[PDB]
């Protein structure tokens, strides 16, 4: 019942290969709904989920104007951060930003977020109080002073507690058939002999939404955390996700192993065994 909205910005310089590219993507939980790419033939905010299409021309124009302004602002920021770190004009650098709001199962604002990174390292982040900043170093301290003078934290707090929550609730309503529908994993256990004395037990979870899931293997009721090969949760390409957990078991000992599945879409958690 918990929901979140996030925007992910990536600004990447490419000296000798034109101006920095700016891409913005918007998500509601694990569903992308908008994109903007400064490298597109005609850069404009584009729908990426059917429930956002009903938004009028003023919505699309408002989004496009914000992201076009961001493209220019981020190009200046890349120049500034190059300077703050005494970097040469030769290297390619990346600024990333992720911000948004989290709602509880009551629809109330749980917390707001606004974090920025430089070359994949934390740079500056809005604290949970939505009033103060955490600057990673002396370079980020310059950004902090600039952001305090512009009153950014106060503007962000108004957005995070206001428009962010308001728009997220609107999207949750407009896309309730998908966004508020939890698809349970379809589960099974496969058996793969690895040798005469050992076999792999692989516990599968397919077609689930949202991505959050827990897949564990237990031997005689005790967690096999160190022995479990756990793949990263992966997108199926149709909104759903996939994951598997594997254990190498001594041949003949298969019934001492149980796979445990926890997901929001399930009426009750699952306990599965290999079924020969």
């Amino acid at each position: 019942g918990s929901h979140s909205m996030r925007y992910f910005y990536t600004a990447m310089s490419r000296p000798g290969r034109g101006e920095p590219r700016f891409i913005a993507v918007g998500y509601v939980d694990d569903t992308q709904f908008v994109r903007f790419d400064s490298d597109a033939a005609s850069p404009r905010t584009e729908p990426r989920a059917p429930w956002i299409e009903q938004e009028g021309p003023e919505y699309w124009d408002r989004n496009t104007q914000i992201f076009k302004t961001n493209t220019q602002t981020y190009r200046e920021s890349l120049r500034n951060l190059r300077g703050y770190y005494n970097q040469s004009e030769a290297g390619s650098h990346i600024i990333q930003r992720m911000y948004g709001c989290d709602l509880g199962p009551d629809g109330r604002l749980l917390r707001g977020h606004d974090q920025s990174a430089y070359d994949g390292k934390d740079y500056i982040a809005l604290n949970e109080d939505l009033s103060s900043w955490t600057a990673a170093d002396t370079a980020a301290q310059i950004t902090q002073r600039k952001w305090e003078a512009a009153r950014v934290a106060e503007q962000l707090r108004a957005y995070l507690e206001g428009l962010c929550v308001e728009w997220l609730r609107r999207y949750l309503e407009n896309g309730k058939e998908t966004l508020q529908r939890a698809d349970p994993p379809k589960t099974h256990v496969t058996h793969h002999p690895v040798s005469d004395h050992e076999a792999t037990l692989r516990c599968w979870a397919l077609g689930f939404y949202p991505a959050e899931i827990t897949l564990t293997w237990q031997r005689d009721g005790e967690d096999q955390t160190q022995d479990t090969e756990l793949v990263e949760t992966r997108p199926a390409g149709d909104r759903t996700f996939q994951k598997w957990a594997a254990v190498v078991v001594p041949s003949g000992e298969e019934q001492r192993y149980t796979c445990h599945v926890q997901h929001e879409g399930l009426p009750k958690p699952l306990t599965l065994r290999w079924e020969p």
Binding site: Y7, A24, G26, Y59, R62, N63, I66, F67, T69, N70, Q72, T73, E76, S77, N80, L81, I95, Y99, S116, I124, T143, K146, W147, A150, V152, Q155, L156, Y159, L163, C164, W167
Partner: peptide, 9 residues
């Protein structure tokens, strides 16, 4: 809807 204020770093 995204945040509408763009502030240079």
């Amino acid at each position: 809807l995204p945040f509408d204020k763009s502030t240079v770093m």
